[PDB]
């Protein structure tokens, strides 16, 4: 993936702004994890 883009636990590349926004973009819900 790109350095400016987050990589889920299952390799999928998403935008960093779409992380911890409450909505399970990645199939396994990796973006919303580690959310203090």
């Amino acid at each position: 993936c790109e350095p400016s883009q987050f990589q889920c636990t299952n390799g999928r590349c998403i935008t960093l702004l779409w992380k911890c926004d409450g909505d399970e973009d990645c199939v396994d819900g990796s973006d919303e994890k580690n959310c203090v």
Partner: protein, 158 residues
């Protein structure tokens, strides 16, 4: 999920507005359609209801929906929140007053949520048009082709 995306909605509450058609006649419905705003390309439409989706009186759980059965609010698990224009639509997301649904090109927009026994559905006459992007008109988004710029309602709540 809550930082500001949904916490803001603790102030807003559902209301009971007049619906053009409650299913047999005109009634004040706990879910009143206002401003079905379809201008996106893929057939995605955002419709504004009189019910709070994803808010529960104590706080966010994003599977609950609150609506007014009188002067008294009440929050329930979303039993079947369905949008329908000519065939059932696909509920992309819901937040606060709004629900984002991918819809067939139909002619009347209908929403509805069950409570238990009760149906609580509303229907407005609004033309939903499938707006293909590009130089070929196509009744439904293909599997493959060429990516072209288009305007669509983001499903992020941010």
């Amino acid at each position: 999920d809550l930082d500001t995306h949904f916490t803001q909605y603790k102030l807003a509450r559902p209301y009971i507005a007049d619906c053009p058609n409650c299913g047999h006649s005109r009634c004040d419905s706990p879910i009143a359609i206002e401003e079905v705003r379809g201008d996106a390309h893929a057939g995605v439409i955002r419709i504004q209801t009189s019910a709070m989706f994803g808010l529960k009186t104590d706080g966010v759980d994003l599977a609950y929906m609150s609506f007014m059965n009188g002067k008294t609010q009440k929050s329930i698990k979303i039993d079947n929140l369905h949008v329908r224009t000519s065939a059932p639509c696909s509920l992309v997301s819901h937040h606060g007053y709004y629900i984002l649904a991918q819809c067939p090109p139909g002619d009347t927009v209908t929403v509805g949520f069950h409570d238990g026994p009760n149906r609580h559905t509303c229907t407005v006459a609004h033309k939903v048009e499938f707006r293909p992007v590009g130089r070929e008109k196509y009744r439904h988004p293909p599997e493959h082709g060429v990516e072209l710029p288009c305007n669509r309602y983001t499903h992020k709540r941010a």
